Design a protein around this ligand. Structure first.
Ligand SMILES: CCN1CCN(c2ccc(C)c(C(=O)NC3(c4ccc5c6c(cccc46)CC5)CC3)c2)C[C@@H]1C
Length: 305
């Protein structure tokens, strides 16, 4: 007794393809690996309630492959299942709007994701993968489940695993349009270097944009000659630090030990705000263990001869 229902399949949720599914067989039997709003349905059999719904199915035909590459800018066959797997959790996360920004209530060690999401709403980033563009616009508004599930998928991270914020930005930065970004550095006889792309906007070793401009000791003195970017990201191993209102855009606080601690996010707005997931405190001065600081920028040229 052969019953059927109509569903849609997709790899990108923009191009829907209509499917008739035998209610007697499993989705996997008919589509291969198959997901519904994250939940893997590959060994379960169609339900009546399934009529009309969209189902994610790994690209098996060259059409789906093309649609898939064009949406994610990856060909990694495991990507879609990882995104769906991550998505099955992040959809249960809560995303409060703390301070006019979208955060994440703590869960499964997602403090790092929260801090990067907050940061990503405060700086000028144009994503090239449409998936990320679309996921980010929704996350700005308050629905950040997909952006977060994509971030894990691109960065090959499991739910529950604490990630490193600097490393994530780096990954994301490589999927964003930072081609126009330029950095000129001089070391001191005098040896000048030119950086571009993600290397133009990132530095490990000091938290202070002012120090970078004044002069940093190295194994000699390195100093910033020219910055052409919308922001710069100053990182360094965690260290006690005074954050002064108006002198930065935002910053990552890390308390704890290597690969087993906890991130908070500090934002300079009308005052210093500490966004700890769903929790929020306010202080005019802040001092704490900091490892990333962001500063907005347009164009900067040294005055050093
Ligand atoms: C590809 C190799 N990756 C090495 C780093 N891994 C990782 C994962 C998760 C976290 C929270 C941290 C971390 O804890 N990152 C921070 C950090 C804390 C403490 C110390 C740090 C030092 C250097 C630099 C950062 C530090 C010295 C002491 C907070 C920035 C790192 C990811 C990966 C395996």
């Amino acid at each position: 007794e052969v019953r059927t229902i109509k569903v849609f399949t997709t790899v990108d949720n923009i191009n829907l393809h209509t499917q008739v599914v035998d209610m007697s067989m499993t989705y996997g039997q008919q589509f291969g690996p198959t997901y519904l709003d994250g939940a893997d349905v590959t060994k379960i059999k169609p339900h009546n309630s399934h009529e009309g719904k969209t189902f994610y199915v790994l690209p098996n035909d060259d059409t789906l492959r093309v649609e898939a590459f064009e949406y994610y800018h990856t060909t990694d066959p495991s990507f879609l299942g990882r995104y769906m797997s991550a998505l099955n959790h992040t959809k249960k996360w809560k995303y409060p709007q703390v301070n006019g920004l979208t955060s994440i209530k703590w869960a499964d060690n997602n403090s790092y994701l929260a801090t990067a999401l907050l940061t990503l709403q405060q700086i000028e980033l144009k994503f090239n993968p449409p998936a990320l563009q679309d996921a980010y616009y929704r996350a700005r508004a308050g629905e950040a489940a997909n952006f977060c599930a994509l971030i894990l998928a691109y960065c090959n991270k499991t739910v529950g695993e604490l990630g490193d914020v600097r490393e994530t930005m780096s990954y994301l930065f490589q999927h964003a349009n930072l081609d126009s970004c330029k950095r000129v550095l001089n070391v001191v006889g005098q040896q000048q270097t030119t950086l571009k792309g993600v290397e133009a906007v990132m530095y490990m070793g000091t938290l202070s944009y002012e120090q970078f401009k004044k002069g940093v000791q190295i194994p000699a003195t390195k100093y910033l000659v020219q910055q052409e970017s919308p922001f710069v990201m100053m990182s360094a191993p965690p260290a006690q630090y005074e954050l002064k209102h108006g002198t930065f855009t935002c910053a990552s606080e890390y308390t704890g030990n290597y690969q087993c601690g906890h991130y908070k996010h500090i934002t300079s707005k009308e005052t210093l705000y500490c966004i700890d997931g769903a929790l929020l405190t306010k202080s005019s001065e802040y001092k704490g263990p900091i490892t990333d600081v962001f500063y907005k920028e347009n164009s900067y040229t040294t005055t050093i001869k």
